[PDB]
Amino acid sequence: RVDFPRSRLRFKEKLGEGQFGEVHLCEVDSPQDLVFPLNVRKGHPLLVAVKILRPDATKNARNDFLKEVKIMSRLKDPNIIRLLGVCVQDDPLCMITDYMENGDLNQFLSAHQLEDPTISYPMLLHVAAQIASGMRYLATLNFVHRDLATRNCLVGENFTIKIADFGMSRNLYAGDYYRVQGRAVLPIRWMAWECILMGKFTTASDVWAFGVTLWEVLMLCRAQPFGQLTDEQVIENAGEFFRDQGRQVYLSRPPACPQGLYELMLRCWSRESEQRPPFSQLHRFLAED
Ligand SMILES: O=C(CN1C(=O)C2(CCN(C(=O)c3ccc4[nH]ncc4n3)CC2)c2c(Br)cccc21)NCC(F)(F)F
Numbered sequence: 492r493v494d495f496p497r498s499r500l501r502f503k504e505k506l507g508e509g510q511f512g513e514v515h516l517c518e519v520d521s522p523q524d525l526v527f528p529l530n531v532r533k534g535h536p537l538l539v540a541v542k543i544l545r546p547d548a549t550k551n552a553r554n555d556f557l558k559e560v561k562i563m564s565r566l567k568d569p570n571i572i573r574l575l576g577v578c579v580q581d582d583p584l585c586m587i588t589d590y591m592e593n594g595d596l597n598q599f600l601s602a603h604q605l606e607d608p609t610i611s612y613p614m615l616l617h618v619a620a621q622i623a624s625g626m627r628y629l630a631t632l633n634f635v636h637r638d639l640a641t642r643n644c645l646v647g648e649n650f651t652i653k654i655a656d657f658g659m660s661r662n663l664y665a666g667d668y669y670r671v672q673g674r675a676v677l678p679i680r681w682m683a684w685e686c687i688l689m690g691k692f693t694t695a696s697d698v699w700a701f702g703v704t705l706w707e708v709l710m711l712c713r714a715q716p717f718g719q720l721t722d723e724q725v726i727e728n729a730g731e732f733f734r735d736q737g738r739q740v741y742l743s744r745p746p747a748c749p750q751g752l753y754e755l756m757l758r759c760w761s762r763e764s765e766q767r768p769p770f771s772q773l774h775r776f777l778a779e780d
């Protein structure tokens with residue numbers, strides 16, 4: 492219940508610039524003194540990522556950061572960001588996690604093509620299975636992510652995946668969010684129809700977003716969901732799911748995706764939230780395959 496020693500965090504480079512803070516890549520000085528679940532290979536650099544709140548950030552930003560610490564303090568799964576430690580008794584407030592050396596999954600995967608930098612079909616399924624495993628864990632906690640997408644996943648060594656949540660402000664992904672003055676920013680292309688129409692976010696809407704995330708993976712992250720349709724058309728499509736007159740449209744089957752796997756995606760996009768498969772089944776399907 493004690494702070495990680497802030498003085499042992501040695502800056503190396505900036506990983507991200509946020510509205511109210513920054514994420515740094517740091518080395519941990521003399522880490523064997525602290526093992527704090529640090530995974531140290533003797534005499535090698537222990538690299539960590541540190542999310543830091545600017546000390547002069549607004550009171551509201553500090554309040555939101557303190558709530559994030561509370562949420563993050565519960566998350567203990569190999570496929571979700573895990574806290575190695577925090578520095579919160581004094582400023583700047585910080586949260587420390589393992590460094591994932593290959594960055595976000597969208598940028599990582601889009602450099603690859605399906606093997607004839609390549610990636611095999613079984614490896615794509617292994618990536619997707621890890622995401623499903625992380626979401627399965629969140630579901631056991633009754634924790635709704637609300638923004639699952641490949642841009643919010645991180646890649647480490649050997650295609651290991653962890654689910655994160657960068658928020659909605661990065662310029663690189665601005666086109667993935669729908670902005671209206673005075674409203675929440677919304678990842679409409681990943682959202683179940685009931686999220687769009689009623690603002691109802693649940694584990695079942697996380698399953699829908701998982702279907703879209705799986706589609707992205709099988710597209711090698713080289714296409715945006717519903718990419719030829721306008722934001723207005725995507726919102727209109729949510730209405731068609733509600734109306735249930737056969738005019739709703741779905742993401743198409745990726746070239747890399749067999750029909751059986753596409754049918755799993757379609758189950759994730761069931762109109763009725765209760766008919767969507769649970770993450771325990773999605774993981775089993777993908778891990779067997
Ligand atoms: O994970 C979170 C929220 N959260 C993040 O998103 C990040 C990690 C990713 N990030 C980065 O800037 C970045 C970029 C390249 C990187 N390489 N290696 C690490 C790394 N980080 C944003 C900040 C973070 C840290 Br750090 C500490 C504590 C929480 C978080 N929430 C859990 C759930 F909701 F999703 F389940």
Ligand SMILES: [Cl-]
Binds near residue numbers: 500541543583
């Ligand atoms: Cl710091």
Ligand SMILES: [Cl-]
Binds near residue numbers: 567573
């Ligand atoms: Cl863990």
Ligand SMILES: [Cl-]
Binds near residue numbers: 603604605
């Ligand atoms: Cl390809």
Ligand SMILES: [Cl-]
Binds near residue numbers: 609
């Ligand atoms: Cl591979």
